[PDB]
Symmetry: D2
């Protein structure tokens, strides 16, 4: 393949480090070696995270087309919109964000702390849909005399939204060369799908596509699974994967998404605590805590072969913790 | 000097990056070149920050001393205690934190979001109110406590971390092929600027370290920086005395109190966040940011200067001031 | 029957007023006349409400026994525990409250606003979680004598008396008014409110005109408690009938989705009532009974010309714990 | 004096009760007898309070003029706007509330609990401007009034706290009236009255009311504005205008207006440590709550006045509880442990 064909706008510090989770690994029995690749520490732009890696391949186009405003969308505590806001400010672009009530949660400061607080501080025009906003948002930009660059949910369903994480696999191989071994599995939280899609494509290149273990956080597996597949095939062709993405190449575990998107279950909370207390690494109740829950449970259930080396991709999301303060009042 | 005689326990990803603040620089006239060294992005341990760089020289001693519990203290939205909680969990140690009511601020979730929320998730014993009664607590419980003062500052090793910072900067200026004429840094408990004063004294730039007070008690802070600088310069073999001239502390941006932002703080936070995508907080960094911007604006920095802003972290505290930024 | 037998400690301003809800009545078709009896405005003690009327019959005993501490229990936003805290302060007694999380809710200020905030200001020892037995024992082991007050004062011998009087009161008022109400709508969760009413209205044969509207979301259990308490009560005041299960009417249609959580209908009802009458209701209790009364009138479940008396039991302070839901009204 | 000349629209349950504060009295020395008239329990419309008494005399006019919208204004936790919202809904009128943060305070749920929360549920159009807006500067008040017109309605203007309005002092003239009657049952006259003052027509009505029987200077106003001179002058002026309005056969002397300044700090909307001890002491002895903004400050006043012996031994003091309790929700951090 050839990802280098597409320009990359630097928004990150550089390759993201991989760190062993030896304490958590031991705590779990020492049979499986757990690691984490820190995407959540990839940037100086309002904490960055996985979406910022994706944005690197979209920005060149936005600039090429002469756009002056980045428009995007997501829930109240969306990480995507905050990163779009930081990237826009950094680039000297305006930013319009459509924030919808994507979650059945009604915390007193849900819309005033965490991610959305930063978006407003970063100067984005943050629009709360009542209670098409998207098209109104795009048009309002034109009417203003601007030129909007449309960034869909999570940057996923976009021609360029999968390039980012092909590069991720590209990084992992380079790091595997220094480590002298290959990771047996990758655990990643999936919702809008282009993170896992990029990974699927990137690891298909060396036959590990089916080793990318996605953990659904959407609580709507079928739609998510379908979107990962579609985006992966599309990206595969965009980069030249000398192989095809089969349906069996997309692995999406649906056991840890409950009860709904944006709501943690008790295992989510346990995992967040276990991981935080054994490694000093925080995860959130919406996304990462669920993929962490999955990984630990998998290890716990012996689903990972003794001796395996599992690479947990930490995608970011921690600032959303602020919207669930009551759950963690006593820790 | 020889900082190497002191062991450093890795808690960071490595040297922190230096970024150009081209947009902000251009916004302010283009006569002064602003940069930022991201101490706020130095670790995977709950966001890290300046305190984490300090703890790298304290941890070896706690370990040497066979301690099993880290003990520290700070205000409710303290960044110090959150970093101790993370470093501890990472190291497999217990953690007791004394969170005092250090700010005359009244907010509904002040003790449930941001820094303190993380410390609890991280497993720390968070006690709201002192220092002694706590340490003794661990002893009485049968554990060996490692006492860590506010900001890791007033401690024999509290100044080493930032002596290393000046060292790092020297290597980066070498790679860059140019030198920074000044550094702007926020000062409250002191060892951050003190380590800096010692490290830059080494190459005659101690007076180029422009501290910005955020304590609102500039005299004590100034005296504490100086004291710690003197002790640290002795620790590392600095071949010279630290004079009053080497300790520069601006007092103009601390208002109105510690933990409380003024309107200049707020404007600085917004300007910096909207020109660079880089966030700062109402307690500490927003004030040093305010200070730096004002300085450039007043023309206090010779035209052509390259100023290195040290971003110490502190962003999570933003959550405790939600009402103020409700509309931006 | 003979309620007068039992001593009532004054904690209220006196009988509660009954107001017409002309606007709400006209709005829903004018076919049914709605009124409200304001138990929510019955006392100067931290807003009071139905529980305070119940407490008038319990306090004499606590005093007779020489108890020095009132101990009680409820969820984080319990109205009962706040009224107990207020009565205590007033009486010069200590107060220990067992606050449990009875609701699958997690709002950021849930445990710092409304009812629980008032109990802490009123001087109560608010304990956030054998929970209850431990509290009672702790008071003893502290050298004090605790007077036990079960959830909502309901499962207590004297807990059903307060509302037998409610029925006494309504009769006196219907006299002054020169007419009688065909129904009473009341929210029911722990039970002694409707039980007291059932007993009191059986006295003149209207027990089954008391339409209880469940807010527990466990109607079988609540229905049984109202039954059980009304029986222990109709017997204590010497009613000349045994309370029949058919005397206990309890609609289960409006308690959804869980106790402590409103459904879309609850919200609409709170807004309609508030916007036509200027009378507020909460999402835990009264909003649900209000939702029921409105739905009943809208479905024609009340025969034309009927005069319905809605008993407003209090609970408004709890609104503060559901701030996100009402951010725009 | 002839208050009966002006119509009054019932918005309250009837005369408000007077309760003895025996435990608090005993606790302070027993040397002074404190009582309290519950204006705070005066209505079924969203907890009512002193402003609702004032409103009974304004509504007839609004109705006589055929207005269909009530327009008012106040800070975020204003008790005034919440009562206007409840009265409007109760009458079948629309309501526009112009609001802005009038306090140097910024609690996380300040604009979403307590008073303002109720106004929104009550169906009022709550126009809350962002910081820096300055409604007083732009004159948002007037724009709100025109917007109603331009919209096809007829607004009835209700100034901050109902105070600086031709009928705003009437309500509390009636209060002195009520007090006389009730004193006629007690068989004794209260030697003093303690009342919290900010926009002034509460105390103003009382001054006019008690002037009629020579006790104007017995109305001990306690400033909650932290801007005593302006408040004092507003009371005096409103009193004189109201006296003339109701036929008082007297000239209100500067000496008839008493406004203590010692308990208003540090600013309007912020409690001092004294305010807090006062709220807690009164709550823990009587089960009667008061707030960090208004009532808690006058309660702190009465208590301090008694403790200091500024009240002659044997004196009977009538504390007027104006309401405001819902505002406590906006100060949860301060009361997190009580
Ligand atoms: C967006 C996001 C995800 C899921 O990534 P997708 O590409 O949408 O599948 C997981 N974790 C975090 C923290 C995110 O922000
Ligand atoms: C602790 C801290 C400071 C001040 O550092 P000192 O060494 O105590 O002077 C500045 N900024 C942030 C974000 C901090 O956490
Ligand atoms: C307790 C309560 C109820 C239900 O009364 P029960 O006697 O427990 O059935 C209804 N409304 C409010 C406001 C309450 O506090
Ligand atoms: C408005 C108000 C006051 C002060 O009354 P003014 O007539 O404006 O002087 C005092 N207490 C409460 C609770 C209020 O709402």
């Amino acid at each position: 393949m050839n990802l280098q064909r597409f320009p990359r706008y630097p928004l990150t510090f550089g390759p993201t480090p991989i760190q062993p989770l030896a304490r958590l690994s031991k705590h779990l029995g020492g049979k499986v070696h757990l690691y984490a690749k820190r995407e959540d520490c990839n940037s100086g732009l309002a904490f960055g995270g996985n979406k910022t890696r994706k944005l690197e391949y979209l920005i060149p186009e936005a600039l090429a087309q002469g756009c002056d405003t980045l428009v995007s969308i997501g829930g109240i505590q969306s990480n995507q919109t905050r990163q779009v806001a930081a990237v826009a400010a950094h680039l000297g672009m305006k930013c319009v964000l459509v924030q919808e009530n994507w979650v059945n949660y009604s915390d007193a400061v849900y819309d005033r702390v965490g991610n959305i607080q930063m978006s407003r501080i970063l100067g984005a025009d943050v629009r709360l849909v009542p209670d098409r906003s998207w098209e109104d948002a795009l048009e309002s930009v034109r009417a203003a005399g601007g030129k909007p660059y449309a960034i869909p949910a999570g940057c996923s369903d976009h021609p360029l939204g999968g390039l980012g994480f092909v590069g991720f696999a590209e990084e992992v191989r380079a790091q595997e060369a220094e480590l002298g071994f290959k990771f047996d599995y990758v655990v990643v939280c999936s919702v809008t799908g282009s993170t896992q899609a990029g990974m699927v494509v990137g690891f298909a290149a060396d036959g590990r596509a089916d080793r990318v273990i996605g953990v659904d956080a959407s609580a709507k597996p079928a739609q998510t699974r379908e979107q990962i597949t579609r985006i992966a095939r599309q990206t595969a062709e965009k980069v030249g994967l000398e192989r095809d993405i089969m349906r069996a190449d997309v692995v999406l575990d649906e056991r840890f998404a409950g009860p709904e998107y944006g709501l943690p279950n008790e295992g989510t909370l346990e995992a967040i605590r276990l991981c935080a207390r054994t490694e000093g690494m925080l995860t959130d109740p919406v996304y990462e805590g669920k993929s962490m829950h999955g990984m630990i449970e998998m290890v716990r259930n012996g689903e990972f072969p003794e001796g395996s080396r599992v690479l947990y991709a930490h995608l970011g999301g921690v600032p959303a913790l602020n919207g669930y303060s009551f759950i963690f009042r006593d820790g």
